[PDB]
UniProtKB/Swiss-Prot annotation:
Location (main, coarse): periplasm
Signal keyword on record: yes
UniProt xrefs under Pfam families: Peripla_BP_4 (PF13407)
Taxon lineage: Bacteria, Pseudomonadati, Pseudomonadota, Gammaproteobacteria, Vibrionales
Subcellular location: Periplasm
Domain of life: Bacteria
Family: Belongs to the bacterial solute-binding protein 2 family.
Protein name: Autoinducer 2-binding periplasmic protein LuxP
Length: 338
């Protein structure tokens, strides 16, 4: 149903050129809008940003700062909901975004819920769509893909974590998984990890629980999983809030021996890493996606071609890392968001 990130870029060489060009623009110093818009642009954001994870909040912060440094006049309406919830608000806010004739509508997709909405925008409106936290183009939309898919590739991050656990434990190691809520994130972060680990190290999956994408749910799921399968050496978590909940569970059960990962490397995760509560995590160079979105909008306003997809990079972080390594990474990742 989805194109792999590299698979997409290899299939369409011109897309790889565009993506590489955006990547270079993101790292290079700000080159302000060459053509001033006579109307400030209207931007609407609908993000499942109400979480312990600071990804969404930092994304808007870095995004707005880059828009500022690029001299782009804009009006931004923001709506933050909780993941796996607030279905009504999400629906009402998305419709309101189109009603207000926004120039750019930014949101995410984890379920099939808003696909028809996307199709409507693409076929009958002038509103451009930016889909955050997804870097795998939807095949059914090959004839007309959204303006931009942006994020930190889930498959890559999960492969990096899988490689690490593969080196930390011997063949046939017992483990359990804590998924996100049912959907895309669980599929691309969870099943990717399970597949590689089982295929390359013959690890033995003991259980895999779907969650409600919250810390409380991660805690509840970890306890349930360990009650039925205490003989595991590690637990792979598919998201920040869930992993932090699992941490609390391990502490309560006195099972600090069990390794647990974070997924994303935001401030709460890094604090847990330095505390030793989280053993490892794949840290994304966070602000790069917010910056990429501002650059993409800039190119659009300059009538330049914009890549269909853009994925930022990751850095593996462990509790054994020195404070200098952590500080150096924060300097890179939160250069704009602070
Ligand atoms: C961005 C994000 O994807 C799922 C969820 O929304 C999240 O915030 O949790 B995460 O930090 O693990 O990454
Ligand atoms: Ca269509």
């Amino acid at each position: 149903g989805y194109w792999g990130y590299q698979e997409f870029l290899d299939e369409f060489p011109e897309q790889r050129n565009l993506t590489n060009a955006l990547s270079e623009a993101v790292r290079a110093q700000p080159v302000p809008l060459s053509k001033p818009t006579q109307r400030p642009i209207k931007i609407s954001v609908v993000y499942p940003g109400q979480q312990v994870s600071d990804y969404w909040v930092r994304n808007i912060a870095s995004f707005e700062k880059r828009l500022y440094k690029l001299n782009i006049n804009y009006q931004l309406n923001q709506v933050f909901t909780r993941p796996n919830a607030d279905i009504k608000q999400q629906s009402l806010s998305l419709m309101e975004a189109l009603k207000s004739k926004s120039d750019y509508l930014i949101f995410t997709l984890d379920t099939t819920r808003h696909r028809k909405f996307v199709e409507h925008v693409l076929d009958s409106t002038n509103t451009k769509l930016i889909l955050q936290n997804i870097t795998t183009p939807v095949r059914e939309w090959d004839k007309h893909q959204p303006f931009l898919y942006v994020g930190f590739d889930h498959a890559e991050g999960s492969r990096e974590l899988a490689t690490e656990f593969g080196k930390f434990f011997p063949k046939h190691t017992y483990y359990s998984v804590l998924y996100f809520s049912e959907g895309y994130i669980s599929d691309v972060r969870g099943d990717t990890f399970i597949h590689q680990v089982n295929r390359d190290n013959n690890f033995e999956l003991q259980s895999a629980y779907y969650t409600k994408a919250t810390k409380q749910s991660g805690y509840d799921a970890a306890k349930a999983s360990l009650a039925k399968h205490p003989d595991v050496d590690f637990i792979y978590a598919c998201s920040t809030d869930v992993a932090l909940g699992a941490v609390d569970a391990l502490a309560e059960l006195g099972r600090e021996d069990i390794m647990i990962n974070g997924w994303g490397g935001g401030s709460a995760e890094l604090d847990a890493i330095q505390k030793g509560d989280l053993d490892i995590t794949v840290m994304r160079m966070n602000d790069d996606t917010g910056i990429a979105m501002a650059e993409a909008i800039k190119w659009d306003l300059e009538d330049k071609p914009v890549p269909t997809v853009y994925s930022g990079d990751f850095e593996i972080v462990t509790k054994a890392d020195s404070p200098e390594r952590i500080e150096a990474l924060k300097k890179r990742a939160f250069r704009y968001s602070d």
